Amino acid sequence: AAMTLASQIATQLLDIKAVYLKPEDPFTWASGIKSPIYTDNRVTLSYPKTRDLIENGFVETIKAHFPEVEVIAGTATAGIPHGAIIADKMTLPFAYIRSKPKGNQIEGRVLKGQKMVIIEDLISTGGSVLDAAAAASREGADVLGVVAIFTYELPKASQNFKEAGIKLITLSNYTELIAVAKLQGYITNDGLHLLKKFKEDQVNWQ
Amino acid sequence: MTLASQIATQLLDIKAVYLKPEDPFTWASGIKSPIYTDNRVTLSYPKTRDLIENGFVETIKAHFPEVEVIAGTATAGIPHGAIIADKMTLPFAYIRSKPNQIEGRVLKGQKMVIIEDLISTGGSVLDAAAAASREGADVLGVVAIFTYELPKASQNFKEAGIKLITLSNYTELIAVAKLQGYITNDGLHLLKKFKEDQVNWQQ
Numbered sequence: 001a002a003m004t005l006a007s008q009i010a011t012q013l014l015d016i017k018a019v020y021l022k023p024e025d026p027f028t029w030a031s032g033i034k035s036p037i038y039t040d041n042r043v044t045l046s047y048p049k050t051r052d053l054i055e056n057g058f059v060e061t062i063k064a065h066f067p068e069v070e071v072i073a074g075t076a077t078a079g080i081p082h083g084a085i086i087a088d089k090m091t092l093p094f095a096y097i098r099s100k101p102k103g104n105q106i107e108g109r110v111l112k113g114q115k116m117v118i119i120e121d122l123i124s125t126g127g128s129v130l131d132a133a134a135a136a137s138r139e140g141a142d143v144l145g146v147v148a149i150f151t152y153e154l155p156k157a158s159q160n161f162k163e164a165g166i167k168l169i170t171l172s173n174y175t176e177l178i179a180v181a182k183l184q185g186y187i188t189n190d191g192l193h194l195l196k197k198f199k200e201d202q203v204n205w206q
Numbered sequence: 207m208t209l210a211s212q213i214a215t216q217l218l219d220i221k222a223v224y225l226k227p228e229d230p231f232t233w234a235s236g237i238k239s240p241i242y243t244d245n246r247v248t249l250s251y252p253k254t255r256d257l258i259e260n261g262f263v264e265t266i267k268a269h270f271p272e273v274e275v276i277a278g279t280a281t282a283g284i285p286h287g288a289i290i291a292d293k294m295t296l297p298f299a300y301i302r303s304k305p306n307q308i309e310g311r312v313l314k315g316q317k318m319v320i321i322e323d324l325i326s327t328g329g330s331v332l333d334a335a336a337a338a339s340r341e342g343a344d345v346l347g348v349v350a351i352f353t354y355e356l357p358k359a360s361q362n363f364k365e366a367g368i369k370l371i372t373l374s375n376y377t378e379l380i381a382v383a384k385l386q387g388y389i390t391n392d393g394l395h396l397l398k399k400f401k402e403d404q405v406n407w408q409q
């Protein structure tokens with residue numbers, strides 16, 4: 001009970017296998033990339049204890065970073081369940097933002113100038129949630145920022161958010177998760193070393 | 207007012223439902239419809255959303271006390287189902303519209319209530335229901351915000367052998383529309399005829 005929120009979330013993600021770490025037997029991602037990590041935080045939705053931790057963490061970080069928020073928008077599709085729960089908990093309007101149109105991406109009703117926080121599940125490059133913010137801004141939102149469950153901490157995501165001028169907060173992150181994984185025996189020191197290389201360079205980490 | 211008429215009053219007010227009997231919408235099938243529904247806008251009105259989500263919880267708590275997972279139909283049923291699951295401290299999952307269609311984790315034989323925002327023919331949610339069943343869920347039933355009360359939907363559900371519960375319905379909603387002046391008696395008559403016959407109601 002003395003762990004950071006980031007570390008508590010990582011503990012539970014590993015425990016419920018929302019995240020698997022197999023640095024010495026890696027996954028193949030799309031695009032021919034081998035990865036020591038697989039993430040599916042939609043699994044958290046099926047574990048009320050973990051889900052409550054995450055949704056309560058989101059509400060707390062939003063109040064802290066974006067107290068003037070007027071609308072909670074979830075990124076289609078993975079960010080939607082979390083966003084809806086957050087909006088219910090804060091007694092705020094909810095909207096969601098499609099990946100593409102069927103004046104067409106926001107579902108719900110958002111007033112011009114309404115202050116929005118956008119909810120995302122996972123940040124890799126941030127491209128998806130950044131495009132969501134772009135669509136929201138086109139349709140009249142005042143986007144305060146983004147909150148996500150987790151980030152791979154890729155330098156490219158930092159660059160994307162900075163260049164876009166959009167604040168990102170995350171509840172947990174790659175560094176805390178691989179740290180907790182080793183502490184808890186999910187990975188060996190050799191595995192931890194490989195995971196650190198993966199953050200540095202996704203192509204030549206092996 | 208009953209919960210159904212309360213819901214309907216708020217759907218009309220926030221323009222989640224548009225009634226145009228004298229100038230109908232056209233459906234993919236070619237049917238002209240006096241009604242358009244977008245219940246996603248309920249999500250942006252906390253008073254209305256609270257009423258709907260609490261309504262869902264009560265009816266699930268009564269009709270499906272053995273439910274072990276709440277599943278939302280992608281995409282419009284997802285936000286409602288997620289809030290329902292949070293309120294009930296239950297597992298949540300959701301079901302993709304097309305192909306592994308269950309997202310989340312559902313074990314074999316886990317008892318599932320499926321959440322939908324609108325029943326027109328019921329085809330989408332029944333496709334959701336078959337996919338979840340193929341993947342091991344024990345589908346208990348479907349609950350939806352609103353139904354057009356189409357005979358096609360009734361027969362679809364009876365054939366599939368699946369219970370449908372709804373919070374509000376076409377008949378009660380067009381009654382509130384007339385009472386509140388959103389339609390005239392002529393429009394109400396047209397709306398009633400559409401429900402009895404979707405092909406010949408303008409004749």
Ligand SMILES: [Cl-]
Pocket residue numbers: 244
């Ligand atoms: Cl539509």
